[PDB]
Amino acid sequence: MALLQKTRIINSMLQAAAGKPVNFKEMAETLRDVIDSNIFVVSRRGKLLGYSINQQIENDRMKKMLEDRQFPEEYTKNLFNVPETSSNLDINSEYTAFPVENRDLFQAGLTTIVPIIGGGERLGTLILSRLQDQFNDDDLILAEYGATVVGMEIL
Amino acid sequence: MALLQKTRIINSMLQAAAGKPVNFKEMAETLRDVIDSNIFVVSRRGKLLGYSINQQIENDRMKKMLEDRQFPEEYTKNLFNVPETSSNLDINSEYTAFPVENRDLFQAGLTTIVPIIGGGERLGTLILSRLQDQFNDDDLILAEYGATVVGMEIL
Numbered sequence: 001m002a003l004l005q006k007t008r009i010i011n012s013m014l015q016a017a018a019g020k021p022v023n024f025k026e027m028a029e030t031l032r033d034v035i036d037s038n039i040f041v042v043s044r045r046g047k048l049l050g051y052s053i054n055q056q057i058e059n060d061r062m063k064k065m066l067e068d069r070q071f072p073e074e075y076t077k078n079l080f081n082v083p084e085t086s087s088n089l090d091i092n093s094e095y096t097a098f099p100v101e102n103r104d105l106f107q108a109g110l111t112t113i114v115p116i117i118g119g120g121e122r123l124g125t126l127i128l129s130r131l132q133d134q135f136n137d138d139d140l141i142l143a144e145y146g147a148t149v150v151g152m153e154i155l
Numbered sequence: 156m157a158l159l160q161k162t163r164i165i166n167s168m169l170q171a172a173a174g175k176p177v178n179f180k181e182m183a184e185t186l187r188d189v190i191d192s193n194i195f196v197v198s199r200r201g202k203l204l205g206y207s208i209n210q211q212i213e214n215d216r217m218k219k220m221l222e223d224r225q226f227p228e229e230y231t232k233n234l235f236n237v238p239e240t241s242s243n244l245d246i247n248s249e250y251t252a253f254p255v256e257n258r259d260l261f262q263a264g265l266t267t268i269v270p271i272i273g274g275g276e277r278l279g280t281l282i283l284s285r286l287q288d289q290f291n292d293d294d295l296i297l298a299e300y301g302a303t304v305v306g307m308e309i310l
């Protein structure tokens with residue numbers, strides 16, 4: 001579908017979502033649907049405010065993080081070192097969203113890190129991940145729109 | 156500039172604009188800058204919540220509306236008859252944003268009407284106008300993003 005179709009899907013969601021209580025799961029699912037990627041909305045200290053999986057997780061340590069709604073400390077602290085969007089980070093990146101013990105299986109795994117910013121303040125991080133298919137400009141447009149509005153719906 | 160550059164300009168504005176008091180003038184100016192059009196943010200009953208002019212107004216009746224921060228009653232009521240975005244409406248359209256007494260001078264004037272929607276509710280209208288250059292998909296993406304976020308910043 002055109003980008004205009006995908007932005008219309010996000011917009012339709014945002015237009016209905018006010019003034020119901022904020023739903024970060026719904027925002028994560030909508031972004032998963034239009035970007036075709038796993039989506040994690042991560043607080044400054046690693047809390048999963050919302051997420052949506054595009055591919056089943058066959059890693060017990062990762063499935064635990066979802067259940068706990070919490071990402072690891074060191075991983076989470078290091079996200080602050082990325083000040084702007086950084087896309088298509090591969091399995092060997094310290095920022096990868098794939099479990100390092102399964103690097104071989106996820107050799108084609110790609111990760112995009114999108115700072116969520118909220119008032120001169122870093123409020124969290126929007127993480128996107130998927131296999132094989134490089135993120136493009138349209139994906140970034142949609143990811144950054146999501147991160148921006150998430151930053152608004154966070155406040 | 157790419158669309159990604161223009162969306163980044165809107166995003167940069169929205170990211171800084173929280174949690175300062177809502178600034179509809181700033182949103183109108185930002186959209187004027189990235190869409191290259193006059194921008195009017197119009198309430199259900201015709202109040203100009205914000206606007207930004209791209210072309211000097213040489214029509215006293217129009218300059219009066221800006222000063223008054225108020226569009227005409229009948230014109231404003233009729234906007235409700237347009238339920239979805241309708242772009243590139245020409246000088247002969249009842250919805251034109253150009254003054255009808257200057258149709259000849261503004262023969263090339265084009266108007267885009269974008270409902271602002273806010274919770275199953277029509278909250279107002281975002282109007283874009285300019286001369287000669289047809290609005291395209293990128294312009295609509297930006298206009299609808301603006302209308303959606305304006306709908307959020309309205310609430």
Ligand SMILES: CC[C@H](C)[C@H](N)C(=O)O
Binds near residue numbers: 071072075095096097
């Ligand atoms: C969310 C943490 C991610 C999966 C990190 N690459 C790890 O293996 O711990």
Ligand SMILES: CC[C@H](C)[C@H](N)C(=O)O
Binds near residue numbers: 227230250251253
């Ligand atoms: C804002 C109203 C507009 C300009 C309308 N076409 C009129 O002439 O009154």
